[PDB]
């Protein structure tokens, strides 16, 4: 399993998904959506969540991300408790995909550095964009940005403050460098 791993990080609404879609569609990347892997992990730790945050994190007998987000994004203390529970398992799961996968692998994660995933990467792209731009694009951003102050530019910075065609040109220039 010969492969190259490129991390794609950046704050919410900056353009990670969009960059990753381009890498997938034009360059053949296998995209590891670290958010989705989080969702799968949540289901695996239902009992511990209930132990941490009460039955309300649930809808019926069921983990509900809207209710959980309501809790964890009101407090750094709460968010840390969740991160301590799910990050180790998500890391293990990322590593496992990397090991089983050949070719170009893209690790899409806002929290690339916080989770130590950047150390799995051969190169890192950080997507950046102005606050005003982020707020026009994503409605959770006002609330979640407050918990992303440690997501600072690393590796190759790709500014996404104009058009999609312009973003496509920049992604192509980066791939010319590293691929």
Ligand X SMILES: Nc1ncnc2c1ncn2[C@@H]1O[C@H](COP(=O)(O)OP(=O)(O)O)[C@@H](O)[C@H]1O
Ligand Y SMILES: CC(C)(COP(=O)(O)OP(=O)(O)OC[C@@H]1O[C@@H](n2cnc3c(N)ncnc32)[C@H](O)[C@@H]1O)[C@H](O)C(=O)NCCC(=O)NCCS
What is the DSSP secondary-structure string of 101-134? --EEEEEE-TTTTTTTGGGG-SEEEEEE--HHHH
11 and 52 in contact (C-beta within 8 Å)? no
Question: In whole angstroms, what is the distance from residue 31 CA to residue 42 CA?
Answer: 20
- Residue 172 and residue 179: Cα distance in Å, rounded? 10
Say whether residue 81 binds ligand X (CB under 6 A): no
Q: Which of 2, 163, 176, 177 is in the footprint of ligand X by CB under 6 A?
A: 163
Q: Is 123 in the site for ligand Y (CB under 6 A)?
A: no
Query: In the set 32, 82, 106, 129, which binds ligand Y (CB under 6 A)?
Result: 82
Per CB under 6 A, 171 contacts ligand X: no
Binding site for ligand Y (CB under 6 A): 12, 34-35, 38, 42, 65, 68-69, 72, 79, 82-83, 86, 109-111, 144, 147-148
Contact residues for ligand X, defined by CB under 6 A: 10, 12-18, 127, 137-138, 160, 163-164, 167
């Amino acid at each position: 399993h010969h492969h190259m791993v490129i991390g794609v990080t950046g704050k919410i609404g900056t353009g990670k998904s969009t960059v990753c879609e381009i890498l997938k569609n034009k360059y053949g990347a296998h995209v590891v959506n670290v958010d989705r892997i989080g969702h799968e992990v949540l289901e695996e730790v239902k009992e511990k969540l209930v132990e941490l945050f009460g039955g309300s994190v649930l809808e019926d007998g069921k983990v509900n991300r809207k209710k959980l987000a309501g809790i964890v994004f009101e407090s750094r203390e709460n968010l840390k408790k969740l991160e301590l529970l799910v990050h180790p398992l998500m890391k293990k799961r990322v590593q496992e995909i990397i090991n089983k996968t050949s070719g170009l692998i893209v690790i899409e994660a806002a929290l690339l550095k916080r989770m130590g995933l950047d150390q799995l990467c051969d190169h890192v792209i950080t997507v950046v964009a102005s606050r005003e731009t982020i707020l026009k694009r994503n409605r959770e951003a006002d609330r979640r940005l407050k918990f992303q102050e440690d997501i600072v530019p690393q590796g190759i910075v790709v500014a996404n403050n104009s058009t999609l065609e312009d973003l496509e040109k920049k992604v192509e220039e980066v791939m010319k460098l590293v691929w």
